[model samples]
Target chain A: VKYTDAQIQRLREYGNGTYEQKVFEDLASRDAAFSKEMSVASTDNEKKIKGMIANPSRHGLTQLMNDIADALVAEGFIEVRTPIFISKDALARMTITEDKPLFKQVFWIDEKRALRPMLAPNLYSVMRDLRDHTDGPVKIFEMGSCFRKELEEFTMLSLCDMGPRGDATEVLKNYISVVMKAAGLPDYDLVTIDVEINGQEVCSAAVGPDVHEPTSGAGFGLERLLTIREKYSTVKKGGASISYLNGAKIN
Target chain B: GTVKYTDAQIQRLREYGNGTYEQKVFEDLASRDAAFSKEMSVASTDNEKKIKGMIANPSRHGLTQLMNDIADALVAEGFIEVRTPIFISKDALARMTITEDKPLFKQVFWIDEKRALRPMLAPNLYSVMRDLRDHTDGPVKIFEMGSCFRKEMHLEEFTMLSLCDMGPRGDATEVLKNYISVVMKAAGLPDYDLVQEESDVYKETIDVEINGQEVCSAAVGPHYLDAAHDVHEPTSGAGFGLERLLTIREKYSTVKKGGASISYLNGAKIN
Candidate 1:
């Protein structure tokens, strides 16, 4: 109908909300043809919305997590869910001291406890004790939540394979390869000692987790795979949310 | 949609919980053995990288990379990166107007009688920005990206990227969109639309949607909660589903495949 800019602006206002019947009538009377166009647009919008929603839809964040866990466990990796909470004293042992910004930034449960910000402190306790408990190749993989001083909590999968002191990285190469293959992203790049699936990197065990043994493991965000794999614009889409389901917009 | 998988194959894969897709198909995937490999292609970030340039920062996960990227953009744009705790007190929630009987209160993950995991980034941001406003002039710009806990209705634990700028001389609505657009641009999103939605707290809010899905619950403020936090300035803020951003970017069918869990990794189903 080629309505004036003011009329088009009014229509935009109507589109964002509901225009009063009087308001619509005024516009419709002035441009009767545009009223017909509005009807078509409403139906068109509905159709477009219906088309945008995923069919055969399922939430893929946890689905992918369980899938990877199953794969890691099937390969004889002892998958474990350690305590997600940590004590203040134990946190100090991991160097989360008073002076560091990390200590203040943590989610404190009380004067002496807080949620685990990373699996490192908890994993260090396990490895140090387990290293003492057993002799060689103390293997355990952990995948669960790590609370940080930020908006979203994280899920980290750490495949800790403690072998002889110097042989950790080589073992990690094959272990990660198996993990990537099972997760169906076998095309990740391994340059020198680092690994990159389409350029962003993942890990190869401890030092960051501390109490260094010969451990071959990596803690990578499982969500990244979906973003990189599905051609999404951001990594935020790949994780748990009511907004984007399986990297597609959740209408 | 591309008709790559036969009806037989689709139903079979669906039975295994691995079917559903769009027109373009997966070709020469490294994970060709994957069940949905034929119907969907694995998208890659071949050109974008900052880590491969250096040797010291060995491995950065995809989610962390994106966070750092957004943080970098925000910082460059004059916003402060504020890191607060993952847990907050019940008093804080009360200040946000969620008393004992509220639906949102029921969703909180309490660590004790007093404190619990934060359900949203609002309380902390409010307090921090309030202090920032008191101490400074002009805009109190800040952002935080971290985990927020809620009951698992597909989100037991998830990431939210909260960006807020208090006291922007410009209209709060436009400022909110500006913040979101900066983030999306940093994340490489090409297009989006902002729509106003009715909200109990803000009266009205503008939300950013990609492909029609509301990825974030956004608001410009002088909300009721603001008085509780002693916040007096005009504000614009948004708490976005970080995982959902990943999903929309790569175009996955469901959001869970893109997040932290035991079931999925790199968008491929393993179980």
Candidate 2:
């Protein structure tokens, strides 16, 4: 996926800065499975994956997600909807983890003194704000995209803090139920949950109590899931829609 | 699958009105289900005090609870925590990438004497690594889950739980596995597998798969992820889309409903 010297020069001529060319070129070289795309994602295949998330052909994964929200709210979980942006004091949560590309490009409001990364922290503030009032066992969910950096190329659907534990485990279970049920595949077992591509186990889900910690959460790769659904269900290409791209990094 | 709670608990829930969920907030209960809302409302207030009492040490609110829960686990896993400058030099950022190359944000707000809203997280850490060159060790491990911005874009764009790492030390293969395993385990991923290729960092790039689907990808190096990402300041690191991760976890859960579900991406996913 590495960019050629000519490509670098072209980007440079466009006033896009050498640092960016270098970063992009490097991303290109790394993701062998990925091809350069002027659209959104990396390769057409990758674009298909992202499209699956954006356009669910049969299963309607998006509708399932909404079902999850409706169900959770009905269950007495304190659904706290936090703001997308917050004070720098708030964003510090994610920065605590090392080696992630924070996308140094940020927009600020000096008057408010804030940056926008993700709402995990803003949600945290919301949780704190609600603690005194709704102290009983509570489950709050926030579903939206967190803006960190200006580029839309990296936008993702972020859902935070579900169930007892706030990791990906809890979130995954809730997602599949609604999606599978909508698609008439609700009873699939761990075999279906055990996701593996090309005989290699990539990611899977298990039905049981999480032993790692007291709180639990789950996550689904929206692009990948929708891609699989589309690969199986539909026939013709819906339209002249394009795909999304992402650069692979090593550390 | 229904669970039971004290009548008081149900009553407490009723008093909260539409609850905090946007969907519930929008549903005019009077039209959709007025009876349900009315019944829940009266029941909750009657047992408000009693219900609020049972909740486990309500730490921060539910929002904070989730953020801290994710953050604490990440920090405990050795992702070095850091403080990113809320206000970064605009010219400096523009010097790195093409934010203004297009009409990204309508307005880039001002900070102090100089600086615009930070559009990315990697650069701040990149610079910090440069500033701390002397005191820091082999590879600086830093993780920041914060909010960054682009003024002209969607007004709702804000908040990110981004992760990064920098270090020349540690075996690439082993370290990368540990990184993925730690986060996946936290998310309750079971028997997960990955497809990996060499990345720009002289290391491996991974395509995470679950049920034969690639959900996430990461680069492995002697800190190559950082290097390839052009984290020139100090080292390389790892990161995942918080929302994407949530989606993966939602797929793995048993009940498939409630807060711990993949409900967040409903609209955006199919939009």
Candidate 3:
């Protein structure tokens, strides 16, 4: 940690990528200070490699999702995975038609298929099948990568209550509260539908007739939540980008 | 190792009445060995030749090449290549006089109350050039190219190449136009028109449009933003949207084809 910039530069130039045996021996015996510095660096690398081999660190995104999933499972919500490639027919049914403003943002693969811009259509399709398949409250949630062709993107955690005993808004609050605590958010801005943490809206919910049954659902941006909760500078730091694996930069 | 389908069979498989996609192919195949050996093409193994040829000429990411080309051209014109962070403080925009009342403020993708993904590169360049001006005796010529986020227009985590020349300068507008000319020739954009447009920051900006699309914006100033950075020199600066330039240059139907999207690579559709 105390290595000077000049010293680090010298180390980089000397090694290139790794120290050749001749160069390593020459540099080690050349100066007392340099030899000590090299030894310290070697031990640190050795320690890190040993530790990594013995007990690798857990991925932050996976850990976050697993913890949240546990909380949801405790609350009677089952997690489900949906297809990433969605048909335009699915989008059209969601009222994202040609004339709508959001229609322009669809990542259309071809004339027929597009990536899921949001998580509602699959939930709606599932709820449709469940309308007759089950008579009790259908509690389900899905979380994965969702795409849009606008300014940027997000990972959505959409939870739905198909048939609830309480008011839709109240049920929405309870579900969000469960998630918020699990997500390390002690409190959040709750007006009714949209919930903003630290002035950035991280979640949006709706309550009304959906899928031939009265429903309450909310979609949360998990990246946004982790960004605010973990105090990351940008949403991408907590996102699924290759540059950043989880909250940590890969390179 | 090679596959081809008859026109009718292909069309029928895509949207026609079918079981699974593979099932449709099976039922409608009329046999690949029979079709390829005789009915497909008498020309020997036409499919894999082009595929191998295309692979042999592996290409760099389109946006990366375009950015490097423009950068090399600017440096040749005596512009110092500079780098800046994609993240900027919210105060930086405030220094540019963008407050909550401004329309652009609403479009900002704020990471927090104090910070945001930079909507424009002006603030960072302004700071860097201002500091460089203090250290140098003559003009500070600098350029930075990177991602800029703005929620307005057909945006896609766009790449912006922003450049500025500071110190005892020539006419602000003239210098700005000269820089735009250098940028256009570098980006392989042969023809473009300069038009005046309204702006929240510059009040009015010189817009470079190609085929009715705004590809770049430039402005010259001893304007208000100077006072915040303790900058006194008149500056000429511009931001070239690289994806927009690529889209216009390649004549792609959408900007996504030219962008840093997983959906497209080096100006070809993948999805």
Candidate 4:
């Protein structure tokens, strides 16, 4: 499943962004076993699927998002909307600052504010604000744009918890399943890479809640899922579509 | 029908209606003070007070709800809702003819020397549609609704909902009208005039106005900016001011008062 650099570029040229190209490379190499198990479709369906892939509307992706949200809401997850701008003080509380790697990529609005680099910081603040006001076991999710230098405007679907910290990995798996099923691409591989710095895990392929909040959730790049579903699976192209050619990029 | 109250209570009554619990309390306070009668006489229409009260409550405020409804309707009609980056490069702006001398240049909120917050959704949507045109043979109808920044006389930041239809030229006007109908129905608005108007900002344009105030502007274009991107398709599009529409619906004094922003929640007063 290891694609050469040229192959990755070819995937990108086929309308996959870098994030999707990377996901495709991983899945093609590592998930061949799963791919084999998937039901083989009729030629007629394949033709229809190819037409969807060749010219996909962004609604294909957004419809899946709405479907997923409806499912999550049925499961008692409250959908919250937070602003894209966060103050420097908010970042400081999360221990993200000037010397940190995250700070370098910030799109600063002024001395006090910048576009949010992740949903976690705002979710943390929101959880703190709601914890004292509401009851326990707060389950909230946000789907919005997060920015970083060269990352452009990317959509993230994140779930966070406030009370009775659940199994981080289990929560991640559940939502991923929900999204996959809703998108009609139920057969895809899930891979996790435990990220560490100084031998302490601060980040991972699947996100765990912050130290302050006993929360465990995951973040998925909308484009990554759409690209994988569109390019490999038999599912109709449905979900958030990001324009690779017109979007922001990093050298 | 004689009453008496304080000046402060009368001012609150002017901002908030007499029907609500909050307004009832203000009315009760106003009844005791003689000066309240004088203040109430100078206040504007009761409709303004009703709108102000609606603005105070977040749930009653209709901008966000209307936006979501319109978005859902458009998606159902095969219009893809895409979000472009809020910032655009100086070169991109310049290509839109938004030069230093232009009115928009003065309002552009620069993130750095090279980039600024997008003043309009059209230019970005143009580039995206142009890229998309090569891949799809059918019509590429995409819409984006978000905050656009500009330095205006009374408003600095406002929300815009724009729809772009790129395809054949023959039925461009009809397509634009169909899209407008979808928006109007979603907005729960009555019929609005589609007055033909010309502007430096658009080509073959029509304005959606109610009572002489334009809420939306539509156009069929062989636009100069599209030519710059080497996209010569017959594109028809429109952008509506969400705040303006809300203002008209709620009978508010200004766009800011009807907006979703918390600053004007108390009827032109800071929270």
Candidate 5:
């Protein structure tokens, strides 16, 4: 009843619903200082993330993945998609047995199968099989989700070259360079994880063999690279978090 | 699991297994598998190479290439590609009016009680558009392409594409027509028909049919955005079965024989 005529009119204009009226009432304080103090200033990252949500043209993750694929194609690497599910035999070929710790991380589909945790096993088979057909280099790459238990899921870009292990590593390094440059981060460095295993690299190339061929390849965590370029703390946060897009976080 | 074959079946196997170009391949595979049970006498490198060549069919590779090309074309036309979760919440489906008795619900591959492998992209797209509605001023153009799972006699997984427009009221029908025109032209298809078909969700949907096969569906309405409570903006969108489009484009009689990763690789039969 103490409300001014204009305030009452403004409340009515807010909407007919009691819910909307309540929202208006909450913001209708007469003191300018009160309103200013009550409002939260949206951060730059928050604003950008909101903008990305509104205008998808501002979103960069999918575009970057596509761009990387484009670069790989220009370099004569053909893209292939293997199945998402893997069998125990394939896991065994990759040396991931029941005794191995890696086996525990696998998301089993049924008794005999599990969701593929990496692209290498299937790619290894594909490379060896293709090697039987092509006399020259067999360059193939795949980009898809690789599942794990603790982590939600990660998109992996794996490139395999079945010619020589040494040359494959070189090719992988060059591919990484191209991806980094295209992603607008030309100043990144590679730290070889270890002789047998790698750590701390957004992408790591390794030399491994199935019963068939000693394949040399590199696998890049797409989200890892995007997070570096987009300035997010974690790859999952940067890539898939509902609160963020690219590197920007919404308030 | 021990099995038995009829004498006629064995006879046919032996007969055709000894026949022409087919006979050589059969002998190679038969001998290869036979050698495998013995398990190490198989120094048969020649047969191994032959089998590898037979198995190294790139039908999936061809499918990905087609998908990539279509994606590039759409991206050029201002369609932003989005990757939504392959598994959608069952509650989301319910909001889309997909009940337990719906045909789609019956065919859904349930991941668990709460979620299932999405049989369609429409529900997710609808939700995303609503999230963006309050922030965007104009048309929200986007697309998503991924595998949709359905239980069927022979086929369980299929690739699908959704091209959407979440713009102002009355803008969608015209926008949808243009979207279809641009997409069909980009896909290298000829003039086609948009047949109006009745649907529980959209009341009627405009289906794109090439030859006698329906390859795509488009819907516009007050109903299209029904589930998206915050998004009252009139919306229109279309979806295409990627394999079906590839079948029509590649001139394969069946989707399985075409780009679908069923019986063929790079459109070549494996068996």
Candidate 6:
């Protein structure tokens, strides 16, 4: 009741997710006595909330999609919202899912209707709607949250498509440029991406994408960026801050 | 009875072939053999064909109902709905990605046995803006939903719903705000936060918060604008994953109507 009411009030006031978790924590725990007296929690709810404050999405995947979308929109691209359901025959006809992990999880609404497993198939439906009317140098991006393998946390995919006039490279570059600019990182920087899940580094880019360190495009991870900001500013660590809120509610 | 492999080696074996180990194979084989025997009890090709022949003819009912609902929403909102092509040349699609990767899929299915599936949804929409080049309409708002494919190791199928608005950039933002507000209400999306990050330049980074946690995000005009090939001029973009939102909402309430509580969401309601 405490957190629910607090969330409701937050939604009424600044929407559900607008403010930092401390606001909710302060409200939920009714810790007016501790007001502005920072508490480092060593107890259960304190620890959990601290964790929630640390990683709010429950699963880190959704946050990644949101991060990418944020980058795309900041660069002048508009979103295209599509449906969540699709026809089984239509999917079968295209052979898109085929013999992949995609086929089985499709929750069938009926013999003909199936819950969509991927956003690309529905994006194809959207394409048919715009085939004849758009102009050149146009960019359309959709951050459609899609479902697949209901187990674990649901995976979220963000797909961006750019169609511009002139050669393919230029059109694609323009799209990439927009994304890089919106991400607030240098276009070129040394990057270490962990491709292998086992902490093995498979590739390193000095200037990536087109920038010069080793010619790399601007690269930034949302968490990493937030960590950097927290280092210099008063903003709480994204994960720690969110964890504190979720932990308080869960416990 | 014992293996001399290292722990990491054992872990990899368990991940990739634990079930196929000799100790487990016979158990699975026995089950499969029994199933194979039971399958022989069912009808052969003849019965299957007969059963298939008895299925019902297609009904336009569901799609019709949905399209009407969508048309009503758009029409009521005064959006001049638009349509785009189903296929585009694969070559036109290929030029969009500069990353070192194979084609977006294992094999491209050409519609006329010629061009491939439209890799991205933008061209069809872009083509629309071209067709209307001569028109003197004040502004346009369009939306589309359908399938798209990609060749990725994780999975390939994608379903996308998208909306586009054209006018002064400022005007489009305002329209989008109003439209999204209505859509969120209709969809029962509660308050959520948005976050923004710049690609490279530190000065341009910003994050938006919705509800109590960040849900949507964007960053603008950072230093890395020209990171892709050679780029001229400034640009920006934003998107949200549909599944992510559903998953997030499911955490809070029982959005699913049937079967087991759509598993991802804890069945227990949020207090």
DockQ category of candidate 4: incorrect
Return the DockQ of model 3.
Answer: 0.02
**What C-alpha root-mean-square deviation, in Å, does candidate 1 show against the real structure?**
23.0
Identify the candidate with maximal lDDT. 3
In angstroms, the error of model 6 at B45 is: 35
TM for every model, in the order presented, reads 0.51, 0.36, 0.46, 0.66, 0.72, 0.30
Q: Judged by lDDT relative to the true structure, which candidate is superior, 4 or 6?
A: 4
- Provide the lDDT at A246 for model 6: 15
TM-score of chain A of each: 0.66, 0.43, 0.75, 0.63, 0.72, 0.46
Local distance difference test, each candidate: 0.61, 0.41, 0.65, 0.62, 0.63, 0.36
- Candidate 2 residue-wise lDDT, B66-132, digit = tens: 3445655666654444434445676555544434554432355555445655655655655544433
Best by TM-score: 5
Assess the local accuracy of residue A5 in candidate 4 as a C-alpha lDDT between 0 and 100: 51
By summed lDDT, which 10 consecutive residues of candidate 1 chain B come out lowest? B46-55
Docking class of 3: incorrect
Q: By DockQ, is 1 or 4 better? A: 4
TM-score of 1: 0.51
Ranking by TM-score: 5, 4, 1, 3, 2, 6
Candidate 2: Cα lDDT at B260: 25
* Candidate 4 lDDT, A7-44, residue by residue in tens: 44433332222323333446555355233322222233
Evaluate every candidate with DockQ and list the scores: 0.02, 0.04, 0.02, 0.15, 0.15, 0.01
True contacts kept of 4: 0.10
Candidate 5 chain B, poorest ten consecutive residues by summed lDDT: B16-25
